[model samples]
Target: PHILTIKHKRAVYYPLQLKAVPKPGPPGPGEVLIRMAAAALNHRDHFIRQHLYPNISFESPLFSDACGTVVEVGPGCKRSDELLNKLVVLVPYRGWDGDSPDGPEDWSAFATVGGTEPYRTLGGGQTWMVAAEDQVEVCPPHLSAVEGAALPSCGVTAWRALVTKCGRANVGPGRNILITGIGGGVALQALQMALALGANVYVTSGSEAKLARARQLGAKGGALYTEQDWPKIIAGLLPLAHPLLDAIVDGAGGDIVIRAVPILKPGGVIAIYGMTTAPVLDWPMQAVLKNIELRGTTLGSRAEFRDMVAFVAEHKLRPVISRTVKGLDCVDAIDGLFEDLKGGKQFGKLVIEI
Candidate 1:
């Protein structure tokens, strides 16, 4: 088997190359061999191509999210049946072995699961993979490998944002919620999870078509984020009783604090992840006056990941994939995955099948 690995040859521009490596053989003790059926891209992969990732690696597999079936096992393995021949989603982060409000003690809250030793993920861009036995979890029975691939990275991040920080307790009937930049995977997942919890959810997107799709996915309403007056329009669309949003989940961090303050109710929670827009944000003092809670979130722990899968299953929530390209070998088509993500043209995950 040949696995694709990224080679970043320049700092200012992308001379990045994708080269194939001979795949690793049998998994060692406590390891499992995964025939990764599908994998999905994230914004991080897009940055890697641009040679812009902070911790850029040369000749490493790029993707972090995958779903596959266990094809083989190694020595000293327990619970073999639970793993062998069953479809599973790889836990995207490496550490976080147990349940906690935080991640595992030994590694940063978000650890790289696919290592450069042979490239951590199946291929960052290929199908065959070897994973630690505990590094994977059973996928929801109803989900195809493509759907399962959408669940790991974005799924855990959104789960922690909504379930842990925002909490279903705050997301019930009559409560108004907004998911900003509703086109991304994490934002769409947040919208999906929030709607499942019975919230009256609205979305913000620069594209009217994307907004229409979000509304089709059960959003109460949507507004154009390209305009400065989106918050005002969204406020008008909300129920008069719950005119102000109870909470908002955002992956882009820049200027949100200022813009969101007007529409957020007092004591409302703003769950933030990454700063895709810019590193700097315009933080207005009104957030302080309103007693707004800004909770910084990232990928969830293994326990939270499990709970997220369960929640997705319970609600039968579709992860809302934007497009699918069959097979990892489609190099020309594969480039579109990165281009779409880089241009912010996609409203959901772009999946590649093994």
Candidate 2:
């Protein structure tokens, strides 16, 4: 019974079949082979599982965030061998070579293995991986492997929303920043990232408990999006601390652009990454009159990934991890991970030990 077959093929009793079972071929020049310790799932995974996402790969391993140890480093980066046995995290995006300080120009997208394969962290969900030299970073000392695993997809998305899309200069003290649908991974991190940048961050969630939790993350209190008057309530909360909001990070798109036009200060930006509620925007004419900007964003580039990780480390920000499975072998645990996501039961990132 070979290790690969037992883990990859013999798990028929399990719910989903494991694929691309972690064949990290020997480290080549400029590459590193990693033994991934943990991975975190994203809503994108749920979409793929349901065949809802475009370009979904049913044959490869799924997922894109991973944290692990470098088992081998290639000859071209032999000096990086000092990283041998070092714990590090892998970034999902790669191949955009332009280093424009703003971000990758002609920016495309990313995933797991370092090519010769259609990379998306499918390998991330599996036990082993190989990354290009540029993709791995030493895991922050302050973070456990699971925490580090939680950082890539949503973490980079949050960083882009606040620092890049929202603009670093615009996110300082006295700036009112709204982060909507607060309980998911990106929104939760956006809550912390905006606060770390000294913005008077406010949040919206259907759950009162999550609002309380956001306050624990240093938010300036928030309103329930579930309430009909939430936008007005959010506006009223601002008199005590900052100006009308300078920007918003919203994942739910249905009517946020509509609601935001009334509350966002003129020229404020609304960075939208996903439309979990509804994809079509019913534009409010007020948005045009106010000169409000709707900036579309998604998970960030590798450079942004680096900056996000560094900032998270610098701020000592801990990602919200609402669920953790001890190992990948438990079919029930793995099934429950995705099931919770389907039910929208998770308040933060869901992680699994590899």
Candidate 3:
């Protein structure tokens, strides 16, 4: 076994340290080794740091999304010949044992590693990783490692919210969707993906400047949620006779989700993924009476990750990467998030280079 040294904070609220781990030599029977190039930050990572998320006893090396090139393969790996040296994004989900009759459960679009135990926690924060070959997908040649690094978690989550959970299966042309918090990486990606799929997109943000950026990215328009009752404003923007709405993608789960319910078309889906504001909310039963579906989603399946990459490549969608911080500066990066929340200065994903 080869020794690979790495660094990470001991606890969610602690500082990082440089330490050695067994270089996961070639994959086991069906795994592959990835030489990681870059990894991006997520709000969930921030949550993890604050101890807001569940404790799953993740090992040091804690990150979820990474971009890398395959360097080695273990025994019985079939796709080794096809993926070596290719730029790829790692999709970090393995199906649970006994989940399906066909062997292991097929990895769900929302599966994540390290956040749960029984799966080794070689988070994307490290310089390398070993995963099943199926967990990796070739990134578009046009994207740099930094760009590719931003795709896996947020991109896949957005796709799952709109296409998978929201049931806007026919999400092309003339469809209207409302996304809350345009400054968030997932929200921005959701807006872009929705626009690419021919939907009319609306965004809500505290920052007018961020709203302007969203508008420039093909949002029909947006309102400052801080200044307006967003749902009421959206209602005023559309004619009463018009269809309520094709879908709603909401991350701010508290009053926003409650407010968005009445505005959806009958049978339309409201997919709630994150609780950036607050988790508990008064359920609006009247809207449910209208046959509106309120669905909850997490990260997406491996197949969905592949599809997200393909879609981005096909449409040339560039993820909004606002800044790149060195890995050693993670504390500052985390602090920047709180500052951005307070000052409303951030407009896209913040990346960390290790």
The residue pairs that clash in candidate 1, if any, are 62-124, 63-124, 114-120, 114-121, 115-120
lDDT of 3 by residue, 241-344 (tens): 56567788888787764677667777777788877666587777776687877788777765677777888999888888888776533555645644454444
Error of 2 at 134 (Å): 0.6
TM-score winner among the candidates?
Answer: 1
Top-lDDT candidate index = 1
lDDT of 1 at 144: 93
* Per-residue lDDT value at 266 in model 1: 91
The digit string of per-residue lDDT tens for model 2 on 16-90 reads 654444365888889888887887777777655544555555444556677888888887894486578987887
lDDT of 2 at 270: 94
- Ordered from best to worst lDDT, the candidate numbers read 1, 2, 3
Q: Give the TM-score comparing model 2 with the true structure, all chains together.
A: 0.89
Poorly placed runs, candidate 1 (over 4 Å): 11-20, 103-110, 114-124
**Ten consecutive residues with minimal summed lDDT in candidate 2?**
1-10
For residues 96-150, could you state the per-residue lDDT of candidate 1 as single tens digits? 7555666567754445543233335444355677777877888888999999988
Pull out the clashing pairs in model 3.
Answer: 63-124, 108-301, 109-300, 109-301, 110-299, 110-300, 110-301
